[PDB]
């Protein structure tokens with residue numbers, strides 16, 4: 001789950017994903033058309049009363 | 050052929066995965082070329098074949114369009130397993146040739162089984178130009194991979210990248226290794242890869258800029 005946006009990262013033509021330190025995907029390439037789109041989970045945080 | 054000797058000079062670092070990383074000091078464990086290793090400087094004017102011992106790092110500094118392809122195989126004679134790659138400039142075909150086709154192998158210019166007819170694009174691609182190859186067998190799929198370079202010396206000072214090129218999923222028990230010349234003087238380098246742990250340095254681009262061989266000297270072990 002997450003939001004998607006356009007990417008300024010220049011993927012090499014043989015690359016598909018982009019990985020993070022905790023083995024989660026940072027950016028992915030769309031399989032239909034060749035464009036690079038980012039991966040970022042939706043807004044969350046703690047709630048204090 | 051003349052068997053000279055040259056050190057590898059921190060050349061042959063390659064991309065181990067199809068994953069974009071940026072500004073991460075990632076440490077991999079793949080079959081790399083060890084730093085400062087005795088590669089060979091075969092001067093081909095004369096001819097038995099070379100071993101394929103867990104991957105062959107191939108380099109050649111020719112510009113006159115001489116180097117063509119290789120005969121990655123096992124026994125290359127007849128009637129045996131004989132699944133030998135007939136790797137060429139553009140026809141990367143896996144024909145069982147039995148005996149040696151194209152007469153004795155020099156690429157003159159001027160039945161059993163009929164399977165695995167793989168055909169692909171032009172495999173390779175103004176004073177000097179050096180071709181760098183890192184053919185590994187690996188797990189079933191043979192990986193063949195090429196990078197360009199600008200300046201040409203006897204494996205000069207510098208770092209390069211890989212840019213993987215093909216991923217042919219065919220080839221069984223390759224132990225012996227050949228090389229095609231162009232005859233109507235080659236001077237190609239051969240290095241042998243070993244399983245070692247590397248520490249690759251990326252940047253803002255997707256580009257391996259530096260690498261550290263984690264078992265060369267104790268300083269590199271401290272760095273890793």
Ligand SMILES: *[C@@H]1O[C@H](CO)[C@@H](O)[C@H](O)[C@H]1NC(C)=O
Pocket residue numbers: 054085086087
């Ligand atoms: C590579 O092998 C040759 C074979 O004798 C040897 O002379 C040379 O010193 C070796 N290179 C090394 C150990 O770096």
Ligand SMILES: *[C@@H]1O[C@H](CO)[C@@H](O)[C@H](O)[C@H]1NC(C)=O
Pocket residue numbers: 010252253254
């Ligand atoms: C990353 O690649 C772009 C595209 O050529 C280049 O302009 C930029 O300078 C590179 N970043 C470096 C070398 O730090």
